[PDB]
Structures are given as structure tokens and as C-alpha cells.
Amino acid sequence: SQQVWKLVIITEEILLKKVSKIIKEAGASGYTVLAAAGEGSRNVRSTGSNIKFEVLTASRELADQIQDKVVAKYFDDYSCITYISTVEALRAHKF
Amino acid sequence: SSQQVWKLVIITEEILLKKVSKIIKEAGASGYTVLAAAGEGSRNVRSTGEPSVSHAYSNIKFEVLTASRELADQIQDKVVAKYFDDYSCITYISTVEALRAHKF
Amino acid sequence: SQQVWKLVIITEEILLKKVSKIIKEAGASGYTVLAAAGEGSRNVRSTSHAYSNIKFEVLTASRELADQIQDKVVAKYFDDYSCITYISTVEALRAHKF
Ligand SMILES: Nc1ncnc2c1ncn2[C@@H]1O[C@H](COP(=O)(O)OP(=O)(O)OP(=O)(O)O)[C@@H](O)[C@H]1O
Ligand SMILES: Nc1ncnc2c1ncn2[C@@H]1O[C@H](COP(=O)(O)OP(=O)(O)OP(=O)(O)O)[C@@H](O)[C@H]1O
Ligand SMILES: Nc1ncnc2c1ncn2[C@@H]1O[C@H](COP(=O)(O)OP(=O)(O)OP(=O)(O)O)[C@@H](O)[C@H]1O
Ligand SMILES: [Cl-]
């Protein structure tokens, strides 16, 4: 196993392509996205359901870079939460 | 910058969607996230019968972030007290690092 | 009230029954599966934003057991199918045993 960072982004379904774009252009080796629903307290939803991304990265800087861009671009105008933890991933994959 | 917060996960029957949701909101959590799920478990208490269909999406997974470990286990306590014996559910708690942005 | 381990397996949806059996045939109390989509870098997919993946979560009382399931899944399918796995620790009530 190899210790890596795990960035989670939960945001509006309409931002699927844009956030996928950010992740890939930052140089992450991939991402996973799950369909979700939710409620939050900011009440900023651009449309008046959600997606949850998980991005594993070996470097904390890359996780921070992706988090920073997503938050800077979409936090004010779109339902969006992010958080980071660490996990131990398989060594047979690049992160 | 950042904030160490608690993440409560509840995995239970889909039929408890609104009841568990209201537990979360009434206890004062800033929000929650819920995903449809399938699964198998060993307690064998699914309210609709066993042996159940293993790959039907009959479950839901909640994630609740809170800054207070007291609020997390207040939610978990209640959920377990009301539904654990009667419904196929399961819970666990971790910590994650969030930005001091959201009031959790 | 007790530390347990969480094994996550993200793989092709077509492996749902095969991987579920490995988790079961191994000895894990249960497992949770969620529909998923994604992209990776190996480009081994046997068949982007289509929900063509699945995400397994398996809670185990022991790190050993989590490693065993991970090992069996990777051994059988990693080369031939899109697949990643990771392990973290979480806290669970004693009222459930894993
Ligand atoms: N404390 C929390 N725990 C878990 N998930 C949360 C929490 N707060 C918010 N979320 C998730 O983040 C999403 C967006 O919440 P946010 O507060 O940023 O925007 P919002 O406009 O209030 O969202 P919504 O329109 O869904 O109420 C929610 O739909 C929910 O899925
Ligand atoms: N060890 C585990 N790891 C991950 N998820 C689990 C585990 N055990 C149970 N689950 C999840 O919790 C749900 C409830 O399982 P539980 O054992 O409480 O009830 P059950 O009635 O046996 O469930 P089922 O009818 O699905 O077999 C399961 O369907 C599964 O999604
Ligand atoms: N760095 C990462 N962070 C989060 N999830 C990832 C990461 N890399 C891969 N994944 C997930 O694992 C799955 C398998 O990717 P893998 O690289 O093993 O095969 P792949 O054939 O390149 O995948 P795909 O056909 O989706 O491009 C991906 O679809 C994605 O869901
Ligand atoms: Cl998830």
C-alpha cells in the first residue's frame, strides 16, 4: 500500500464537466464521481441533486490545488462542500 | 485555513430516508449528503424480509459532517436507538479536514 | 467505540457479482455498493460520465482481513479490468461486530 490524500468535492450535478476538467488539468491520475442528494445551510444552489467526487493524489499540493480552484470558482455561486483525508492505496496504481 | 471535523456515516434501508433525514436536521446538523446503495450484512434484520435481494438498491448511505463530536454521536445515538433492532442499518465515524469556510 | 478498517474497491460495474463473492467467500460480515463513474490513467476497461463503475465499501474488524480481500481482488482482476482500492480506519459502535 501507499499513503495518499483523498479529496472529496460534493457539488451541483450541473458542474460535472467543469470540475472533471479542473481535476484532469491539474494532473490527477483520475477521479471517481457518485450521484448524490443532500441539504446544506448556505442556500446558494444555482438552480433555486448533487455529485460527489473522490480524487486520490500522492501529493498534498495537488489535492490543495484542485480544492483551491474548485472553491475559488464555484463556492460563492453553487452548492459546494469539500474535505480531505488520507487513505492507503494500492501500489499498483500511480497517484 | 482548515478545520478538523467529524464525519458520521449511516447506511440503512431506503425506506428510512425521510425519518433519518429529519433526525439529522432536528439535531442541528448544517446539512447531510445521501447516496443510494446496495449491500449485504450479517445481522439479517431487513424489515422487508430475508433472504433479501443482494444487488437491489434498497439502501441509502448518509454522510453528516459536524464540527462537534457531541452532535455526531447525538445523531448516531438516536438513529441506532430507534432503528438498529428493527431495520438493517450500520454506522461509523471518522475525521476529515474541511475548510473553515462551511459552518459545520 | 471501536476502531475498524474500511476497504474501498472501485471497479467496473460488470464485476459486481464476482467481487461481491470474493468479499463474501473471504469472510467479511457485509459490504456496501454504490453506482459510480470516473476516469483513470491505465485505460484497461474491458468493455466517461456514464455510471459504468461500482464503489464497494467493506468494514472489517481487522487490518488483516481488509488486506486479504484487497489482495484477492487485485490478484484476479487488476490486470484485466479497471480497478483501484484503498483502506482507511473509522470508529464503529460495539453494537455491531465486523
Ligand atoms: N454538514 C454536512 N454534512 C454532509 N454534507 C453536507 C453538509 N453540508 C452540506 N452538505 C452537502 O453539500 C451540499 C451543498 O451544501 P451547501 O451548504 O454548500 O449549499 P446549499 O445551497 O445549502 O445546498 P442545498 O441546496 O442542497 O441545501 C448539500 O446538498 C449536501 O449534499
Ligand atoms: N461489514 C460491512 N461493511 C460494509 N457495509 C456493511 C457491512 N455490514 C453491513 N453493511 C451494510 O449495512 C447494511 C445493513 O446490514 P445489517 O447487517 O445491519 O442488516 P442485514 O439485514 O443483514 O442487511 P441485508 O438485508 O442487506 O443483508 C447492509 O446491506 C450493507 O449495505
Ligand atoms: N486518482 C484517482 N482518484 C480517484 N479515483 C480514481 C483515481 N484513479 C482512478 N480512479 C477510479 O478508478 C477507476 C479505474 O481506473 P483505472 O486507471 O484503474 O482504469 P481505466 O481503464 O483507466 O479507467 P477508465 O476506463 O474509467 O478511464 C476509474 O474509472 C476511476 O473511477
Ligand atoms: Cl460514497
Side-chain angles (χ1 to χ4, degrees), chain A, chain B residues 2-104, chain C:
Chain A
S1 96
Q2 55 171 323
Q3 171 111 325
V4 301
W5 300 88
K6 178 169 93 158
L7 167 67
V8 173
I9 306 157
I10 294 158
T11 192
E12 310 191 18
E13 190 182 30
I14 59 171
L15 297 181
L16 175 60
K17 185 50 221 153
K18 278 164 185 167
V19 175
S20 301
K21 171 148 160 113
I22 295 167
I23 291 159
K24 288 182 274 191
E25 290 180 351
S29 69
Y31 61 89
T32 300
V33 62
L34 305 101
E39 301 190 49
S41 289
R42 302 198 297 126
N43 295 128
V44 294
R45 181 160 297 262
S46 72
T47 47
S49 98
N50 297 329
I51 50 179
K52 163 175 175 181
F53 292 88
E54 299 189 354
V55 186
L56 301 190
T57 73
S59 87
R60 175 65 190 265
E61 318 79 72
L62 178 57
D64 287 346
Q65 172 184 350
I66 296 173
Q67 189 181 222
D68 288 340
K69 283 193 76 75
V70 172
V71 168
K73 300 223 268 176
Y74 304 124
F75 177 76
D76 301 329
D77 301 321
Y78 299 91
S79 324
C80 162
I81 59 170
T82 65
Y83 58 83
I84 299 181
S85 61
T86 68
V87 300
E88 307 172 53
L90 71 173
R91 309 227 33 197
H93 205 278
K94 173 212 181 292
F95 296 109
Chain B
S2 71
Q3 198 184 355
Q4 298 286 354
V5 300
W6 300 92
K7 169 161 115 152
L8 169 68
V9 170
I10 304 157
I11 295 166
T12 188
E13 301 187 33
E14 186 269 339
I15 57 173
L16 294 180
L17 174 63
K18 216 171 329 293
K19 285 147 176 155
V20 174
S21 296
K22 76 142 42 193
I23 286 174
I24 296 164
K25 316 182 70 202
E26 290 177 336
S30 60
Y32 67 86
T33 297
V34 64
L35 306 94
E40 304 188 43
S42 293
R43 296 200 300 122
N44 202 67
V45 298
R46 187 166 295 274
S47 67
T48 61
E50 299 288 350
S52 51
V53 50
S54 293
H55 302 309
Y57 278 86
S58 52
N59 294 333
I60 46 184
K61 168 179 169 177
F62 292 88
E63 303 184 334
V64 184
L65 304 178
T66 181
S68 178
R69 173 70 194 254
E70 230 187 59
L71 184 37
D73 289 345
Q74 166 186 347
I75 295 180
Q76 190 190 33
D77 284 346
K78 191 139 207 190
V79 173
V80 172
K82 297 167 92 160
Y83 302 119
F84 180 85
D85 298 320
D86 291 7
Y87 298 86
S88 326
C89 156
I90 65 152
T91 67
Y92 62 86
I93 294 181
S94 46
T95 58
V96 300
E97 186 189 330
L99 301 166
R100 294 183 181 277
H102 274 264
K103 293 179 179 179
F104 281 114
Chain C
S1 300
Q2 92 201 329
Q3 171 169 75
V4 300
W5 284 263
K6 177 170 100 170
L7 168 63
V8 170
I9 306 159
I10 295 161
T11 191
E12 301 186 31
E13 186 273 332
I14 58 154
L15 286 184
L16 176 66
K17 196 183 42 213
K18 293 169 163 75
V19 171
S20 303
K21 301 306 122 214
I22 281 168
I23 300 166
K24 292 211 289 164
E25 290 175 352
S29 55
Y31 62 85
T32 293
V33 202
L34 306 105
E39 310 192 35
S41 36
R42 313 190 291 105
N43 272 19
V44 282
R45 184 160 303 262
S46 69
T47 64
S48 192
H49 284 343
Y51 288 96
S52 54
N53 290 339
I54 44 180
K55 174 185 170 177
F56 289 90
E57 307 188 337
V58 186
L59 298 160
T60 68
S62 79
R63 175 62 188 254
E64 183 178 2
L65 167 60
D67 287 335
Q68 264 185 121
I69 297 170
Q70 185 176 241
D71 282 342
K72 185 92 181 182
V73 170
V74 168
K76 212 286 151 184
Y77 299 111
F78 179 71
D79 269 353
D80 295 332
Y81 301 90
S82 321
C83 185
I84 65 161
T85 71
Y86 59 86
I87 288 164
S88 50
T89 60
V90 295
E91 208 177 71
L93 278 174
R94 307 145 299 221
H96 209 303
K97 282 268 131 152
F98 299 102

